[PDB]
Every structure is written in C-alpha cells, then in structure tokens.
Amino acid sequence: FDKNKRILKKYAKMVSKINQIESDLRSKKNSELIRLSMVLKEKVNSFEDADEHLFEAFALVREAARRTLGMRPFDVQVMGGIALHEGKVAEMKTGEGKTLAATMPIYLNALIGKGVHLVTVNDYLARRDALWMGPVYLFLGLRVGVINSLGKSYEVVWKNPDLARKAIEENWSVWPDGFNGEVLKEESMNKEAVEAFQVELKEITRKEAYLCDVTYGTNNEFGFDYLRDNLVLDYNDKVQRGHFYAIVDEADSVLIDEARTPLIISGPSKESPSVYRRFAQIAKKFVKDKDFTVDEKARTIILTEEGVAKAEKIIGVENLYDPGNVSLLYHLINALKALHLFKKDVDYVVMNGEVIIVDEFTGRLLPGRRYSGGLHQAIEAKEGVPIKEESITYATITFQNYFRMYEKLAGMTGTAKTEESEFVQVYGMEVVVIPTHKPMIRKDHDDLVFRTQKEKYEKIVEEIEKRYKKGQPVLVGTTSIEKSELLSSMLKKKGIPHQVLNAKYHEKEAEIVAKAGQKGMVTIATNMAGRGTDIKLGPGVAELGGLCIIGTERHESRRIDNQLRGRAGRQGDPGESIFFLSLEDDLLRIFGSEQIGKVMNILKIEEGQPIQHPMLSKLIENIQKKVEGINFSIRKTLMEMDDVLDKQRRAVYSLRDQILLEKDYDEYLKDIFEDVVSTRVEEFCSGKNWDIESLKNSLSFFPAGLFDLDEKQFSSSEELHDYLFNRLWEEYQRKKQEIGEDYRKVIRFLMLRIIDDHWRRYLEEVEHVKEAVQLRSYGQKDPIVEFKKETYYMFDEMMRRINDTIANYVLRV
Numbered sequence: 001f002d003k004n005k006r007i008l009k010k011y012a013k014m015v016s017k018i019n020q021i022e023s024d025l026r027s028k029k030n031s032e033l034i035r036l037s038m039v040l041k042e043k044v045n046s047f048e049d050a051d052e053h054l055f056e057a058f059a060l061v062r063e064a065a066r067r068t069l070g071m072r073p074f075d076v077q078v079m080g081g082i083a084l085h086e087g088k089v090a091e092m093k094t095g096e097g098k099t100l101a102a103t104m105p106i107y108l109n110a111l112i113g114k115g116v117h118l119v120t121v122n123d124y125l126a127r128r129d130a131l132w133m134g135p136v137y138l139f140l141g142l143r144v145g146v147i148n149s150l151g152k153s154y155e156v157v158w159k160n161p162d163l164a165r166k167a168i169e170e171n172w173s174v175w176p177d178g179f180n181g182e183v184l185k186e187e188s189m190n191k192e193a194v195e196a197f198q199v200e201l202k203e204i205t206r207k208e209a210y211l212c213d214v215t216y217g218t219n220n221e222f223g224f225d226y227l228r229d230n231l232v233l234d235y236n237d238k239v240q241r242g243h244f245y246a247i248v249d250e251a252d253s254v255l256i257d258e259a260r261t262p263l264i265i266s267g268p269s270k271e272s273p274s275v276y277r278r279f280a281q282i283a284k285k286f287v288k289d290k291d292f293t294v295d296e297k298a299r300t301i302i303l304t305e306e307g308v309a310k311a312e313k314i315i316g317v318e319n320l321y322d323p324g325n326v327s328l329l330y331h332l333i334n335a336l337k338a339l340h341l342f343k344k345d346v347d348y349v350v351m352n353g354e355v356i357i358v359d360e361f362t363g364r365l366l367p368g369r370r371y372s373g374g375l376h377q378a379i380e381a382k383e384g385v386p387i388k389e390e391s392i393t394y395a396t397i398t399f400q401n402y403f404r405m406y407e408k409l410a411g412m413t414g415t416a417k418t419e420e421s422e423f424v425q426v427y428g429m430e431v432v433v434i435p436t437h438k439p440m441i442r443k444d445h446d447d448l449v450f451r452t453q454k455e456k457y458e459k460i461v462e463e464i465e466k467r468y469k470k471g472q473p474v475l476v477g478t479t480s481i482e483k484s485e486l487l488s489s490m491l492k493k494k495g496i497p498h499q500v501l502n503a504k505y506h507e508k509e510a511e512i513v514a515k516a517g518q519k520g521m522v523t524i525a526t527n528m529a530g531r532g533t534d535i536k537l538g539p540g541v542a543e544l545g546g547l548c549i550i551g552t553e554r555h556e557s558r559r560i561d562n563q564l565r566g567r568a569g570r571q572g573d574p575g576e577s578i579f580f581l582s583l584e585d586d587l588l589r590i591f592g593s594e595q596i597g598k599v600m601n602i603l604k605i606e607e608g609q610p611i612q613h614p615m616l617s618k619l620i621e622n623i624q625k626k627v628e629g630i631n632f633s634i635r636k637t638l639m640e641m642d643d644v645l646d647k648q649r650r651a652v653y654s655l656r657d658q659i660l661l662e663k664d665y666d667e668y669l670k671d672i673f674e675d676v677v678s679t680r681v682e683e684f685c686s687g688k689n690w691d692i693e694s695l696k697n698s699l700s701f702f703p704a705g706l707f708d709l710d711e712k713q714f715s716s717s718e719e720l721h722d723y724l725f726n727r728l729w730e731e732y733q734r735k736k737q738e739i740g741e742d743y744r745k746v747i748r749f750l751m752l753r754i755i756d757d758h759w760r761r762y763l764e765e766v767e768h769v770k771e772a773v774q775l776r777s778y779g780q781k782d783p784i785v786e787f788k789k790e791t792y793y794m795f796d797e798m799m800r801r802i803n804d805t806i807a808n809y810v811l812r813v
C-alpha cells in the first residue's frame, strides 16, 4: 500500500483535533497557559506519556508561538511536527517553516526531563535558531541551551527578565485579539509585546548547556563532545547526559553529506626529535639478552630486571614503571625495538633520507606511509636523519554511528525523498513528504546542455545580464570558489554589480535575504552559501516572475541541485529555475557526453547554442540517479567496515566508563589476573602440552620472582592455574596494604592510560588493514568477511596486551 498516504491521512485527523483545542486555549490568560505547561511537565515522563498528551502539548506550543513571536504554526507545520515526534524524516520544502515546525515535537519530548538535541549544520544556524525560537521555549518554562565552537556554550535568557513577567503577569501578546488570519502583519503587531519577549545569549559552561531542557548545536559539536567525553580521567568531566531525542535539521546535509568523513580528534607530535635521537643511542648500550630479551615469535622486545635498572640509573628515575615516567618507558621500547627488531632492508630502506619498505615486494614502495605508534620516528632516529612530525588520533567515530546512539532519532529537510533508501538503511527512518502550505508554482525549466564550458559560462552571463536588465533578481549556484571567482570576473568585465558568497555564515545570511529577493539583485552562491536563510521577494519582483535560480552545473546528486532549486518558489511564490550543463562537465564526463554529443550533432544544432528537451532533461535525471547508485553502494561497503570497528569501540568505551565509575577493582583485577594465567596455561600446559620452560619465558615481563616454579610438583593443570594466580593475587593484596587507599586512583589512572594507548595504536594499525582489504579483496570475499575476521584477530591481541600491561603495572609501582 501507499505509506505516505496512510501516514498523512492519520496526521490530518490529528491536526484537526489540535484545531478544536485552539478555541479553548486562545482565550486563556498568559498565566493560565504557563500553569498548563507545568501540569504537562509532570504528566509527561516517558514516550508512552508523550503520545497521550501530544494533542494538548502541540496546541499549547502553537499559542505560545502566536503570542511570543507573532507566528501561528500552519497545519502543515503541525503536520511536520508530528512526523518528527514519530522518529521520521519530515520532508518539508525549504522556506516551509521547519524551524517553527520543530518547536512542537521538541517541547513535547523535552518534558521527559532527559533533554532534547537539535542539530544543525553550523554555528549561526545553531545560535540563530535558538534565539529565534527561544521565547516560546522560555515562555513555557523551558531552559534553552546552545553549543558552538570553539569553547562556546550559551543559555537563551529573557533580554529584560523584569519585562517578560509584566507581559506574562499581564496578558500581553504580539498577535492582537480578534485577528483571525493565518498570518499577522509586521505592520500591525504590539511592539509593546515584541520588545517584552526579546531574548539574548548568556555564556554558560558546556556541561550546563546539556542540562537544559533542550540543546541547540552543530552536528560537529555534539559528536566532538562525545569523543572528548571519552578522554576524561574523571567521570565528572563529562559534558553530556546520554543521548535521548535528537532532531537533525538539514537531515540530508548532516546525515548523508557531512557524514562521509568520520569525526576525528587529531593532535600534533607530542615528543621532540631531540628525545628520539637521545634514545637512539641510549638503546645502543643495552646488552641484548642481559638487560632485556627479544622474542620476535614474532614480535616484541621485553626488558629484564637488569635493564629496568640500567635505565633507571641511566635516565635516571626512581621508578621506571611509574605513572609519571611512562612516556620515558614507552620511548625506550620504541628505540630499543627499532634497531633490535626491524634490522635494515628488513624491510625498510633509507633512501634520500626517507625510510620506506616491504610490502612483500608489491613492492617496498609503501610511500606509502609510516609505522604506527611513533616507531617510524624511532627508526629515522636510528638511521641518522631525519625525524618527521607525526599526528596522533585520540578518538574517531562516524556520524551515522553517533546519531545511532540516540533513543529517538528524527530529521527534517526539503530534500529527503529521493534518498529514502539511505535514511532507512542507515538510520532506520522513513521519509514523510509533508505537503506545501500554499500551492507550488515555481517554473522549473528543462536543462540547457552546451558543447563546451566556455559556451556554458558565456551563455550563463548573458542570462544574468538579460535578467538583470529586466529587474528580475538572480541567485547563481556554483560548486567551487574557483567557479564563483570566474563568474565574478565575467560579470564585472560587462560591468554588472553583484555579490559573491562562500563561507562566513553570520554575515552572508545577512545579505542573502535582502539580496536575492530585492529588485535587480544578482547573487553568486558557492556550495549552498546562505543556506537556511529564507529569501523574501522584494516589491515588484513577483510580477517579474520572482527570483531566478541558475545552476552552473548539475551535481553528482540530484539532492544538491533541488537544494538550490527549492530556494525560489516559497509559499506559493513565483520563481524560476534553470540548469546549465556542458559535455565537458564532470557529471557528463562521467556519463553520456558522447551519447548526448552525437544527438546534438545529428539534430539541426549545434550552433554554439544549447539543446533543450524534456526527454533530455529526463535523461540527465536518470543518469544522475545512476551515478548516485554507484556512490551509495560504494559508500555502504565503507559503512559496514566502519560498523565492524564501531562495535569494538563501544566495548572499549563501555569498559572505560566502568573503570571510571568503579571504586573497588578487586573483581576486575581477578578477571585480568586470571586471563593472564589462563591463556598461558591453556596453550603451554594443557591437552598434549606440558612445556614449562616456555611458560615462565612468556610470563617473564613480571618482576622476578613470582618465579618459584622450578620446585615443580604439579599433579594437574588446574593446580598450576590456581597456583600461578595465587602468587599474583597475593602480591596485589600485599600491595593493597602499603600504598593504602590512594591505590584505587593509581590503578584507575594506569588502566585508562594503557587502554587509551592501545586503542589509539590499534586504530592506526586498523587503517592499514582497512585499505589492505579494500584494494586487495578482489575477486572477492565480500570485503567485510575478510575485514571482520582480520580485525578480530588484531583486537584480540590488543586485549591480551592490555591485560599483561595492566597486570604488570599495578604490581610494579
């Protein structure tokens, strides 16, 4: 059946019922309305409870909006609101009222007391939307938070707290009593009340911005907060309170487009080359097999008791294995290993002062990149010259995997339907195409395809001239600054005044509004500049045919084109739209230039002119649609792999969180201590095996001696396990005794260190394998199976190394 019809049919009924309420509430006094919000706040405490009072809630919001901003939400805006509350992507054409529309569901689900996240694309839109919708929220007793870069969090407050109360106390409104239109007039609204409900920004802390009933921010910042939140050493330095309900504004932009590059926290090379080189020779003095042992089984180097001492005396620090000197320790291992374990031409080469190697000879030209963990820098230090800046990665996550954390996800755009597949396969969200408020009368012309770019751009500038002379305003869309700068040359060599836009949003939206709509105004916008800022038509301009959209080229995704296009018709406004193409454009270059090119020659054309026909326009659509196909498939494979990683990341973070919150590590240590002994017992001394020389060889990292193994009188493997563990756990207790109660903290710190360390090194390593599988999977274990299985082995090793590193640190300190 038709989902969009059934769903919509239901919404209609609902919106209808919300209308009957209005007559009950429009009569109420400002204090009565606030009292109702209070009753609702205590009545609505879960999702079940939210749908119960959704009628009352949505209606109340409407009124507060009619009295607070002068805007009375349209039926459609109430429709979209519901589609948000239901965890779907409400497709509402641009200039429809999404901002306001979102206010109703936001308010409703915000009464649960777990917070509500509104994500946009940038700072402006985050800050702007807040201040713009703030009064309504404040009026109903909600605290509105806002999160921007760099270290910026604010709280929308009344501009004149005293003045707002007069307006509530007394029954002030912006919308005069008795007006019964769908739209108030800027000319006729009680300025006494507009000025009363003015809102401004108040600098607050990050943590607090989230403790607000709702939180407005950028997709970037919400995610960054989460990653940072997993770099803490105190569960109290977190600035988030879980992930409850998030409405993603500009869904297609955040959840698909901005979402293809994974969110990263990159830093700079911590240590200096001076120290590497200083360790490059500190490492030439450690006598192999005395101060340490290498068992590249392969492949690690592990010190002995003579080596910990040399270094300690040498460095010289009281304790090598202590919380402060781990950097030192760590540095020593890289330098000690580099030349004692990578040799020379096995398989790296120093040619031209650059080290490069292997890869089993496909060939050694992996330049390709440097080794993980700062080992590479250690090699150059060894070879003589010279060390290069490295960039460490502390945390990563993709947007898909992030917004997936939220209990209820929701989004809204004017461009969602064409990509329903994606919202459903990635975020599990349906698209509900909300009808427009007023009829949509914008004339979308068939595309103009030219032979050559020169001809494309030359005939584009004729259009600008031709429409400018007429008085009709023009918004020209480009895809690079390069292309925007070029147009600007052309335009001014024929003396045509105009505005160019790219990326400083607070300012650009400022003119985008006055500029596109106002008579005889030309504006060039790069990459959807002035996004989200509504363009109102100027006086006399509607008769001219309204704003005229020019696409300098079609994008690889019809979405992006419909984003520029939707900018013109508006609320049944008149507007025009045309896309220029050339057989040399990338999209065309990618597909059908020649198939088109020939039809061009065959027909009476081409004169230096363009070919235009519905069937061609339609052809471009299919071709452009097919180019999206191949992308999404490609992209989805990457996604699957990203997910495979994400699952590990969760386990780690979830653990990190527990370590953060555990005051007693008695049980956790037992789990580590046992896994330390169990694995070494089950492989060396079990089934057909009873090799001990090798057992204590593997456990040699610990301080000799818990090494009282040579008095061997083991009857069975269970005795050995239980025993090995004993001397381990006894030591732990013997050590709980002296450090006293400051020990829980010391451990905690060490655990986080080790786990972060290994996590960051793991990720670096994993990347190589990601690419390894990607390129070499052909032809072809579904790349995921290779990756899932290979990534597994690696993670399993990481857990082993973490345990040994943890078990070993708590005992030596």
Ligand SMILES: Nc1ncnc2c1ncn2[C@@H]1O[C@H](COP(=O)(O)OP(=O)(O)O)[C@@H](O)[C@H]1O
Binding pocket: 070, 071, 072, 073, 074, 077, 092, 093, 094, 095, 096, 097, 098, 099, 100, 182, 183, 532, 533, 534
């Ligand atoms: N309910 C309403 N009543 C009157 N005007 C509205 C209403 N909703 C939106 N507008 C007008 O539309 C413009 C805002 O559109 P916007 O909410 O930014 O669209 P979208 O959210 O689809 O991008 C504003 O200039 C505002 O004057």
Ligand SMILES: [Mg+2]
Binding pocket: 098, 099, 249, 250, 532
């Ligand atoms: Mg918007």
